[model samples]
Target: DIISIKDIDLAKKKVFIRCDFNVPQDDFLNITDDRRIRSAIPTIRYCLDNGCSVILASHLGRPKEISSKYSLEPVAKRLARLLDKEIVMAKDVIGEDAKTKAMNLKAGEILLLENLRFEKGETKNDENLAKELASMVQVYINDAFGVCHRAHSSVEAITKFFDEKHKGAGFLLQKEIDFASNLIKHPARPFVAVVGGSKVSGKLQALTNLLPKVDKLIIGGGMAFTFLKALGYDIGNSLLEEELLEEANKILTKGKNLGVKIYLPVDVVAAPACSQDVPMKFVPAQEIPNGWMGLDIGPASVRLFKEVISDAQTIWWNGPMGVFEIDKFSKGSIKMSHYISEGHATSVVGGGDTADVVARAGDADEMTFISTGGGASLELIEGKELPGVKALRS
Candidate 1:
């Protein structure tokens, strides 16, 4: 079992909080999206309310060595506004400056460290850096659900410095774990999992893991063509994972043998090329003519998918049904988002593209749970133990 922050004694302690503040930024270092920052507010507030001083640490964009473009200064400013309090921004992570500020922090005050990636030892999970970070706090709290899959120093190795009793999962991490755990252990039937995306290579393991548990599976997006081809359909110039055709066949065969209903797109909106829109037509999924590529599921497929969704007791949807960035190809994904919103099923939308699609459709509030972590959520759904979560467990 993992310890939750609610049960931990955080009063007057120096609490080191690892958060996912990887918000998108523009050229001027303005945070374009603050969802990630907002997600960590509850946990940070909890610590402050309990008389604990917080030391926040996070990594922004991939800064090969050190780049001003990927700095967390904007996030710190944004967070200060959101929290309605002053946040002391450290000039470094675990250096003399960071340690001095941490030592001087008063109870209920917060200190945000520089990006962890600024130090090369962070990603390597270096013991020296972990020890230095651990030295600054009496308690450790991981609120970053987005980085749970990673075995970085902040997420994993630092746990060893504190006793299990002094380490805990913050509210965000705990909530993510509870929701995801319930889906795997006790799901309401008929459970329908909607898998879409541009590539089969990305979600193949997720498909394999979910196949035995789900009652029905709906395949869409560019990856759907690979499955259609596996069934001996001529996909024309549509997207195909030639390498996974045999694997696709195996899944189809397995789904049939297991009495699981696997639904593939029956029709699609096709275009000559992704960059070109001329000759855009609604074509049968199996009969996309030469020079045409499937970009999105057609109206008929959306109707068919909706019928299954209506009867579903639980729905786990990942990936977009189409290339939603283009207006012409966004219909299927947008419509599906609306359908899921109107349904009574316990719905969970996976992170990354699927989350963006739902958000763009303005249906984010309608879903039961929308994961913040893309790769982390997928890894957990695939039944893999996340390093950060594992570190908190007894």
Candidate 2:
């Protein structure tokens, strides 16, 4: 059986916490928002308060091969200040210095390992490296839901040395698991899924999974054009995935066969060119003006979506209705965000652009849960088992 964290007696053990420190940083390596770092604090604090030695491990940006920007030093500094504990930033993960530091850490001591990505072996899931890292810690606690989908050395291989006796999900990880698991197993009726994005190819599997499960699936954003075009509608200059026309057609057919109401944008806001000052107007999905593109779903689509979503008991949203980062094109998605907040639904929003829009729209707290992992959550919705969860499972 997969071990629950509650089984561990935190007072006596050393807790190796795997966290997501993969935050977006600027060219000067300044952390823009430390929300990811902030999210891991409770777990860190619990370890410290309960007399556990906290050994934190995390990976930063994808360095092709040990680039300096991907270093975890900045994360260590940030974590140290927050926890008020001297954080030993390991010069190397699984190196002599790291092992020495780990061996010397007393109870309630906190330390952070260097960037796991600094070594290509970590990404390759090198068994020797996993064993080396595993040897330094007493127990394993995985809290990085963002990278759980990956089968890297830190995520999957290191768990081999630990049985249910030595490994478990951290508090936030368990909460995320509970939330996502319930969504698939025990969701309330009238589940409304609002899916948007650029390409249909990326969400094809998710759409397939939600096809029979959701009561209503609202489609939007650039991907909507592919479905519209597949149905013989003219989507001039719109961001339609030509490669996914067949897939889009298949989705339409499947939805129709299953009697699932897949709601596509009926009208859209189009412009002669993607520009801040480009004149935009509402046009039917079929009649896109030449050389122009549909940057957003129009007012009619939002109104219709709101009407349908109002009565929803559960709402799952992924992606944005448009290039929402652009001020002029964000109205439709922003409206949806407001509407989701007003609804009585248990709304969960995830996806790269979807999260951005929610934050930009300033309705994060209104939603039930805003996921930290975009590709991971999408993979889960697409019915793929996460490696981190799989490793811990019986």
Per-residue C-alpha lDDT of model 1 across residues 1-394, encoded as one tens digit per residue: 9988877888878999999998877778888778888899999998898888999999997789877787778889999999998999998898899999999999979999999999888888888899999999999999998888988999989999999779999988988888787778779999999999988888899889888899999999899889999999998888889999999999899988999999999999988888545668898887787877899999899999999888998999999998898888999999999999879999998867898889889999899988888889888888999999999988
Give per-model TM-scores.
Answer: 0.97, 0.95
Clashing pairs in 2: none
lDDT of 2 by residue, 1-394 (tens): 5566778766768878989888878899988767778888887887788888988998887888766678888888887787777887778888888899999988878879888887778888888988988888888988888888888988899999887778888877776776676667669978888899888987899889888888888999899999999999999988877889999999989988988788999999899887788799898887888888999999889999989898899999998998887888999999999999879999988875787788888888798987776688877887889998899885
TM-score of model 2 (CA atoms): 0.95
Against the true structure, candidate 1 reaches a TM-score of 0.97
Q: Model-by-model lDDT, in order?
A: 0.90, 0.85
Q: For model 1, what is the alpha-carbon lDDT of residue 57?
A: 98
Please give the RMSD of candidate 2 to the true structure.
1.6
Segments of candidate 2 deviating more than 4 angstroms? none
Model 1 / residue 281 / CA error / Å: 1.0
